A paper describes a structure:
[name] ([name]) is an ubiquitous enzyme expressed in all somatic cells that plays a central role in glycolysis where it provides energy in form of ATP through the reversible phosphotransfer reaction from 1,3-bisphosphoglycerate (1,3-BPG) to MgADP in order to produce 3-phosphoglycerate (3-PG) and MgATP in the presence of free magnesium. [name] is a monomeric enzyme of 417 amino acids formed by two distinct α-helical domains of equal size, the N- and C-terminal domains connected by a hinge region. Two different crystallographic conformations of [name] have been already identified: the partially closed conformation, able to bind substrates, and the closed conformation, the catalytically competent state.
In the [name] variant structure in complex with MgADP, the loop adopts the same conformation as in apo-[name]. Replacement of the valine with a phenylalanine keeps the loop in the apo-like conformation since the aromatic residue tends to stay buried. Conversely, no variation is found in ADP-binding. In this variant, the introduction of a phenylalanine residue reinforces the hydrophobic interactions between the 211–219 loop and the 243–263 region thereby stabilizing the C-terminal domain. This local stabilization, which decreases the flexibility of the ATP binding site, is sufficient to determine the decrease of about 50-fold of the turnover number with respect to that of the wild type protein.
Author numbering: 1 to 416
Write the structure that this text describes.
C-alpha cells in the first residue's frame, strides 16, 4: 500500500538528528550544475526539519554511476553543497565521505540547526551492493561490509527521512538499510505516494492513461496493469506502430516495430474489451525520411500507409483531435511517454498539443499525473510543471509503480 506510510509531516523532529536520503543526481557539464531543479525540490523537506527544531539534517545522495569506486573529481557532490547553500540561505557543511568514524563524529551531536551533505554514496560498492572495479570487472559487496556501511549510515541520525522517490525502486543501502525506529517519506515522496495512490488505489473517473514512448517491449507490463485501473487508454508514440501493423495491417515503413510484442497485441486488445476500456490509437502521422532532427517530412494515415524507407515520428492533426476528446472526458489522467519524437521540433507538435489539452483539463478540475523520465522532461521543456497536478521525480520508479510492483524503498518506510 502507498496510503499507509509514515511521512515527515507526522514525524516529530524536535531536537532529533535527521538523516535524509535525497535525489541530488543533477545534470552536470564538468563540475558545473546545468539544472538545479532536483536540489530546489528537496528544500521544503529540509526547511521543515529546521523550522521544527531538528538538531541536524544530514543529506545523503548519489550522483552518476561511479559504480562503487571513489571518483571525487568526476562525480563529487561538492558542487551541490554550494548550490544548496544559495537555495537554503544557510551554510552547508560538506564532508568528503559518507561513512566511517570521521563522518560519524561530525554527525553524532552537532550544533542545533546544522545542515550536512555527505559525499556520493555510490563511491562505496556497499550502496548498490555491486559495481565495477577500475578494470571494468564485476565486484560484489561482502555481507559484512554491507552491514558496516548500513550501520555507519544509521549512526548519522536519530530518525530517517527518504525524499528520494527516483531511487525507491532500488533495494540499495541508503534506501532499505538504515536501521532506525521511524522511517518517513519526505515531502517529495509524500506527493509521489499520494498521486500514485490515486492512479492505483482510488482514481477519480473517468480515469485515462496516455501511454507512449519508443519501445513496445518495455511497455507490456505497464499496459497490462493500467488496463485493470483505467476507463480509457491512448496508445501513442513509437509503440503504436506495433499495434497498427498487427490490427489494421498497416504499412509502417521503417517505424519502430517489435516482432515479439506484436504476438501479444491481440491479447492486450482482448483484455481491454474484457474490462470495458476504450482504446484510442492514432490515425495519422508525421513521417520522416530518416531518424534525424532535420529529416524531410511527410504525412500519412493508417489508410495511406507510411512509405517504404520512412518512419512515423509523430501523430498528426486528426490523432490530436481523437486524443483531445479522450482527455475532455477524463477526471483523472496518468501520462507516461511522449507521443512522438518531442526532442525535435518537427515531430513535437502532437506531444505539445496533447500537453496543452492536459493543462486545460487540469484547469477545469482534472487530476493530471505525469510519470516517466522523458514525459517529465517534456513538462520541464515547455514550463508546464506547475500547470498539471503532479510531475513525477522518478522515471524508472514511477514506471515500476505503474507496472504494479512494490518499491523496496517505499516498503521500507514505517507504516501508520
Ligand atoms: N514515433 C516514434 N518513433 C521513435 N521514437 C519515438 C516515437 N515517439 C516517441 N519516441 C521516443 O520515445 C522516447 C521516450 O520513450 P520512453 O523512454 O519509453 O518514455 P519515458 O522515458 O517517459 O517512459 C523519446 O526519446 C522519443 O523520441
Ligand atoms: Mg526514456
Ligand atoms: Mg530516472
Ligand atoms: Mg513498512
Amino acid at each position: 500500500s502507498l496510503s499507509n506510510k509514515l511521512t515527515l509531516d507526522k514525524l516529530d523532529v524536535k531536537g532529533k538528528r535527521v538523516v535524509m536520503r535525497v535525489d541530488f543526481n543533477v545534470p552536470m557539464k564538468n563540475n558545473q550544475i546545468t539544472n538545479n531543479q532536483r536540489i530546489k525540490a528537496a528544500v521544503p523537506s529540509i526547511k521543515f526539519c529546521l523550522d521544527n527544531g531538528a538538531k541536524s539534517v544530514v543529506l545523503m545522495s548519489h550522483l552518476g554511476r561511479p559504480d562503487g569506486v571513489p571518483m571525487p573529481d568526476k562525480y563529487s557532490l561538492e558542487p551541490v553543497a554550494v548550490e544548496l547553500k544559495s537555495l537554503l540561505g544557510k551554510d552547508v557543511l560538506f564532508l568528503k565521505d559518507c561513512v566511517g568514524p570521521e563522518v560519524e563524529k561530525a554527525c553524532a551531536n552537532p550544533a542545533a540547526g546544522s545542515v550536512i551533505l555527505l559525499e556520493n554514496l555510490r563511491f562505496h560498492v556497499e550502496e548498490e551492493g555491486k559495481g565495477k572495479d577500475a578494470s571494468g570487472n564485476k565486484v560484489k559487496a561482502e555481507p559484512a561490509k554491507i552491514e558496516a556501511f548500513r550501520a555507519s549510515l544509521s549512526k548519522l541520525g536519530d530518525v530517517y527521512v527518504n525524499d528520494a522517490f527516483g531511487t525507491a525502486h532500488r533495494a540499495h543501502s541508503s534506501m532499505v538499510g538504515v536501521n532506525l525506529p521511524q522511517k518517513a517519506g519526505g515531502f517529495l515522496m509524500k506527493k509521489e505516494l499520494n498521486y500514485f495512490a490515486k492512479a492505483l488505489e482510488s482514481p477519480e473517473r473517468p480515469f485515462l492513461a496516455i501511454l507512449g514512448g519508443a519501445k513496445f517491449a518495455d511497455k507490456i507490463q505497464l499496459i497490462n496493469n493500467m488496463l485493470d485501473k483505467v476507463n480509457e487508454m491512448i496508445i501513442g508514440g513509437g509503440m503504436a506502430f506495433t499495434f497498427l501493423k498487427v490490427l489494421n495491417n498497416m504499412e509502417i515503413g521503417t517505424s519502430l516495430f517489435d516482432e515479439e510484442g506484436a504476438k501479444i497485441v491481440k491479447d492486450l486488445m482482448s483484455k481491454a474489451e474484457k474490462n470495458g476500456v476504450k482504446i484510442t490509437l492514432p490515425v495519422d502521422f508525421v513521417t520522416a525520411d530518416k531518424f534525424d532532427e532535420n529529416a524531410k517530412t511527410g504525412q500519412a494515415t493508417v489508410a495511406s500507409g507510411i512509405p517504404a524507407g520512412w518512419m512515423g515520428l509523430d501523430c498528426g492533426p486528426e490523432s490530436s483531435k481523437k486524443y483531445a476528446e479522450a482527455v475532455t472526458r477524463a477526471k483523472q489522467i496518468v501520462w507516461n511517454g511522449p507521443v512522438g519524437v518531442f526532442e525535435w521540433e518537427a515531430f513535437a507538435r502532437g506531444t505539445k498539443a496533447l500537453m496543452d489539452e492536459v493543462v486545460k483539463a487540469t484547469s477545469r478540475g482534472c487530476i493530471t499525473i505525469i510519470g516517466g523520465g522523458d514525459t517529465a522532461t517534456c513538462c520541464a521543456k515547455w514550463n508546464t510543471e506547475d500547470k498539471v497536478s503532479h510531475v513525477s521525480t522518478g522515471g524508472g520508479a514511477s514506471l515500476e509503480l505503474l507496472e504494479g510492483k512494490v518499491l523496496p524503498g517505499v516498503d521500507a518506510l514505517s507504516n501508520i
